[PDB]
């Protein structure tokens with residue numbers, strides 16, 4: 001029932017994501033010089049360095065907020081992909097599966113801890 005435990009759990013999950021080769025297209029903001037129309041399609045760019053920096057600045061109050069930003073990385077990749085002939089989108093799907101598999105217990109433990117706190 002540790003209400004703060006999610007933060008270090010998210011830091012470790014981000015470390016595993018950065019070592020994963022599938023995170024390569026998502027480690028830094030999408031390069032607007034490489035994709036000049038990117039902002040005509042994507043309203044809110046998001047990437048794993050931004051998520052890590054937001055976490056380390058103490059600007060996430062809960063792991064649900066961090067989740068929303070990580071899922072936005074995958075949603076943006078899905079919206080910007082032209083077709084199946086895209087290594088980036090395929091990497092996004094495997095990385096999303098890995099993320100969801102690992103974040104499930106972080107979310108559950110946090111929500112359980114907060115329910116215990118408010119008992």
Ligand SMILES: O=C(CC1CCCCC1)Nn1cnnc1
Pocket residue numbers: 078079080081082083084089
């Ligand atoms: O169509 C899609 C998703 C689709 C893309 C090809 C692989 C399977 C998933 N996204 N999208 C791009 N432009 N408008 C929407």
